Amino acid sequence: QKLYSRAQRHQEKKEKIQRHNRKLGDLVEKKTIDLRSHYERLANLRRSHILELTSVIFPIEEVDTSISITGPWISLPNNGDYSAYYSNPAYTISAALCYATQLVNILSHILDVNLPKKLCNSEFCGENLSKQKFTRAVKKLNANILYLCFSQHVNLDQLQPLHTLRNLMYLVSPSSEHLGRSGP
Amino acid sequence: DMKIRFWDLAYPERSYVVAGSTSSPSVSYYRKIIEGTEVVQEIQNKRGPESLPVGHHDIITDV
Amino acid sequence: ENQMRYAQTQLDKLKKTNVFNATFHIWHSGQFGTINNFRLGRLPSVPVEWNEINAAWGQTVLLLHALANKMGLKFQRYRLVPYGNHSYLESLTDKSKELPLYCSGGLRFFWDNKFDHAMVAFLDCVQQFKEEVEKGETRFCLPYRMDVEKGKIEDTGGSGGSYSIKTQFNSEEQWTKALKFMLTNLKWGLAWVSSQFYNK
Amino acid sequence: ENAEWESKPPPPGWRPKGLLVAHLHEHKSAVNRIRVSDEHSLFATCSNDGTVKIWNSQKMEGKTTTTRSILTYS
Known part of the structure; x- marks a missing residue:
């Protein structure tokens, strides 16, 4: 008799969890649509910013x-050869790398993308970096920019590890359909 | 809660949070005896923009 | 819910953090008016190196240049050209004069006159900015007055005191305080541009 | 009498400071488990996206030119 009631109660709990899970599935699906709506507004706002x-502030244009x-x-070569500074071309280089770094650091905050290499705007201020110190600083910038391009799904066919502003241009232009999207 | 905690089981007062920004309220750890069980309770203490939070923003499933 | 809450946190950060505020942070640190962690000015106790003042001027000349862009204001006598380290003003009547908004260092702080012209001229650009902002809205007022011909920035908080923006014939404390009021005007002009264009 | 709890215990007095060295976003959905190879050479993550990704632990240490999963299985 107790086993009968147990089967009765257990039959209800099965039905209860089955309908409870449907509400969970509906709610989760309904909130995933809403989540997608949040992500597109955030992607449109990030892109708008x-x-x-x-x-x-930072118009990147071809010369x-x-x-x-x-x-x-303020210009950099497309080849990526900043050799002149290591060796006024230095001021143009320092300024371009300064605003590029500053921009990258602002893009990182707009996009909420953790930059792999820690590079600060000020690193391209102060006394002329040595050849060794400058080169690592440039590699950090190039790696951050490339990372941002990857994060934003910029077409890899267009990116090269050496072209600094050329990649930021690809990352920034309205052609970058995925700019602002938060995803893998 | 997306917080990576470090519990010093020998020295609970040194327990701390690994991941989670310093802007979040700091915590303290107290070893007590409740039923007889010793409990390390965690209690809440009453360069451009802010640096991006490095922590997780969703449930940390594994460590 | 965690993802939606985060995405709503990011949306709220982008609403409040305008593009200008994301780029230029003007705050007072000690006795210096600082822009983007760069101390604009120097004190006898606190020797801020010229490379930090030059960077600060590059951030200032960037801010005003960017503001004038967002306002569609063209300066009457000068073209602001922001070169990060070595920013300067170009005179529109005679390009033969370069007004460097930087110093090469050494004892030239007491002997170089070019940087004083450049820095009074920039005050003119801040004045024209101030005029342009008042012209748009009467309710707007910057906290300090500027006398371009004299190169002075007044303190409304003080008893009508004015500190020479020029370096020569001036003391570090006054200079640094002049640059501190200018940055404060720029900080307010930044708050005005954000107020005028954040909804647009 | 001679069972080792780990094959490679943490350094003496190790107190992780918590510096992010690799933000890896390569699964579409939740990761469920991370297991580290017993010699610690590799670590692997499984996910609701239906993939297994193997990661080279040796390539997170100060040479993060490209923190990529060496292998994916789906």
């Missing part, structure tokens, strides 16, 4: 060619 950033940031007075 990056476009305003790279149009008022073997050269690439500019914050205006054509």
Whole structure:
């Protein structure tokens, strides 16, 4: 008789968990749609901020060619050969790397992307970096930019590890459909 | 809670949080005896923008 | 729920953190008006190296240049050209004069006159900015007055005191305090631009 | 009498400071477990996305030029 009631109660608990799980599935699915809506608004807002950033403050434009940031007075070569500074070309290099680093650090905050290599804007200020110290600083920047491009699913066919501003241009342009998207 | 904690089982007062920004309220750890069980309770203590939080933003499933 | 809560936290951060505020952080540290962790000015007790003041000027010339862009204001006599380390003003009537907004260091702080012209001229650009911002809205007012011909920034908080923006014939404490009020005006002009364009 | 708790115990007095050295986002959905190879050469993660990813532990140490999973199985 107790086993009968046990089967009765246990039959209800099976039905209860089955309908409870359906509500969980519906709720989870319903909130995943809402979550996708949050992510697209966040991606549209991030993109809106990056476009305003790279149009008022840090416009990256094309000028073997050269690439500019914050205006054509500041340029880097597309080849990535900053050899002139190690050896006024230095000021243009320092300024371009300064604003590129500053921009990358702002992009990292807009996009909430942890930059793999710790590089600060000020590292391209102060006395002229030695050849050794500069080269590692540039590699950090190039690695951060490439990381940001990967994070934002910039077409790899267009990226190269040496071109600094060329990659930020690809990362920033409206052609970057995935810019702002938070995903693997 | 997305916090990576370190519990010093020999010296509970040295227990601390690994992951989780310093802007979150700091914690303290107290060894007590409740039923007879010793308990290390955790109690809440009443360069550009802020550095990006490095911690996890979703449930940490494994360590 | 964790993901949605985070994405809503990020949306809230981007609403409050305008593009200008994300780039330029003007705060007072000690007696210096600092921009993006760069101390603009120097004190006898606190020797801020010229490379830090030059960087600060590069961040200032970037801010004003960017603000003028967002306002669509063109300066009457000068073109701000931000070169990070070595920012300067170009005179629109005679390009023959370069107004460097940087110093090469050494004892030239007491002997170089170019940097004083450049830095009074920038005050003119901040004045034109101030005029332009008042012209748009009367309720707006920067906290300090500027006398471009004299190169002075007044203190409304003080008893009408004015500190020469120029280096020569000036003391470090006054200079640093002049640069501190200028940055404060720029900090307010930044708060105005954020207020005028954050909804737009 | 001679069972070892770990094959490679942590350094003496090890108190992790908590510096992020690799943010790896390569699964579409939740990771369920991380197991570390007993010699610690590799660590592997499993996920709701239906993948297993093997990671080279040796490549997280100060040479993070490309922190990529060496292997994926799906």
